[PDB]
Amino acid sequence: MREVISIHVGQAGVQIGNACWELYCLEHGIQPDGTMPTQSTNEGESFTTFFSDTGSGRYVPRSIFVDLEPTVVDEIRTGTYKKLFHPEQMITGKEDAANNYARGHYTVGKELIDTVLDRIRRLADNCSGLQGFFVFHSFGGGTGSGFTSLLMERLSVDYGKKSKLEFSIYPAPQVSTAVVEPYNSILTTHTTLEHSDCAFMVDNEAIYDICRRNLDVERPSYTNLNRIISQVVSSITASLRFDGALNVDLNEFQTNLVPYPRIHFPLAAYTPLISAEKAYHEALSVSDITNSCFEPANQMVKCDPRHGKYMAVCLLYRGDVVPKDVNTAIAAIKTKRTIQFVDWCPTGFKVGINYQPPTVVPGGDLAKVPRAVCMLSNTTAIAEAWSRLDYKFDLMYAKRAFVHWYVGEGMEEGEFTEAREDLAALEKDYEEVG
Template identity: 75%
Template sequence: MPTEGRECISVNIGQAGAQIGNACWELYNLEHGIGKDGFLLEKEENEEIFEIGERKGREKCQYYNTFYTESSNGKYVPRAIFVDLEPSVIDEIRVGPYRQLFHPEQLITGKEDAANNYARGHYTIGKEHIDRVLERIRKQAESCSGLQGFLVFHSFGGGTGSGFSALLMERLSVEYGKKSKLEFSVYPAPQVATAVVEPYNSILTTHTTLNHSDCSFMVDNEAIYDICRKSLDVERPSYNNLNRLIAQIVSSITASLRFDGALNVDLTEFQTNLVPYPRIHFPLATYAPVISADK
């Protein structure tokens, strides 16, 4: 099935959302043979992907359209928005190895964070930024010929990840009606809690987004720490290790959107295949085998 007019916009919210998003785009670029600057890698660097394209007898770029928009000079720009209420995490993207991949308008930051407080993310600080974020999303949506929906990456424990995500999901439901919204959420774990109020933030955001999300894939930090320790032999896993493992899972879930396949070709199909009742939309992602590169 050709992917023309089946675009998805990724919205990465807060520290967890931005860092997972960064890891995901790093992996998507590798899978699609796109360099850090957004241009296709040369054939020698990228033999395998070119072979697949030629073997199928189709234009090699036909799958890029779902997740990337192609500019007039042949650069592939992710259909993504990064939002955080404080600048430090997104500043790392602005100066990091993938700084040329994103347009500056896609990276939106405020000046003070939500301080792990749902109410600040949803009501006070969040309210000041929501219109600017929706405006950027509207611009992304206008560049799509047939928008499928949104992939929202966030954590449940942080103030921005919980409060601002809930506010944005409500507004997306109002402005984009029936468009699908898939969540990729980091659920807090007691062993690796960064704030004592994480359970409150989680309950509040789950309650608010329950009717605005079509399907929510949850990852548990503690489980991912255990996988890194036991399967990948990483003694002290960093956020980088966790995010790259989460990116593998997100990549596997979205592979059917980005490549040719028979199952889960569009976002509504995820709902049809995975969600028994609208409010029970929390499938558990399991991934195997997880083996370190050294083995």
């Protein structure tokens, strides 16, 4: 049937995948050792998109772990989730690229790219309904940028027509770690425009704002930030892993949300995202959280949504939701005038309601709420998020700082110049279409 493959490249690929595949074992009733208990067969209704069958219910994830460094991969090969994954699906590196492009685009990647594309083809030949790709990466990583652009340069030659999905983290304009992240974000945007269907972005700080105010988590780290992103990942798959009245597959997401083949970069949002106590004193209706979707304390990228112009807003609901107030509240959004559209698209809405409510992680900070919304809103606030990063790249480039690492690794300096004219017209097209 339909079967979807996931690829995890970089350390952000490692631990986000350590949460998403951890979460899916809860939502299908699969024990982490590798087999299933017999009670979760009725829950296991069309789980075939990720898990091959082996011998007696033993379910390997159709997932590939790619890293140039063996350290964080051994965390998978130490914990409980060691026996779940397949060993020859784990392909490790030895020498690190250290957030450098040609160290991750030519040096260690080209010794390992031929090993992993076989493991792509070894697994994908079982498919008769191969839909899409979950590729997880960063923007400033050596293998996060240098290998990811090269990997998407090769799978479009192989499979082409079949879809792709990229999840990543938007680098914050104020608080971020690596100094080469303004460099590599221009590099990972250069040749991945042509080789990616859609790519999503989240902020470190925009997670933190709801963590401190609504979750009331005043000591967050990369443990709980992986759980919050994984709920957004799981809510997309709920249209596919279960039987809904009006649901949507991966080819349909890009068909609605891509108005032009270059501007295809929306973001995410999730609500209700609060702690376990505040849901007790409040009855969260449909009109409650849907109006909570379109306020700037709910976006997952810290920018100005009111200074952006909405073009195609996508909505996926979960839980037992009636469509009457849905057909009212989205109309009640249209009664408000602050939600600005473009003049040519009034019909940029998507309706999706699944029967299954989201189930929370065990021992987590969330609360069991029936209603939830995964808001996807492509807008022109991405252009205002382009200018904050195009300011960082050029001024460090003008003094030619940190160029002496990019030179000797098999890389040219004129490629920095061509990406400048490439990204200049990109943020222009938000204002040209808008």
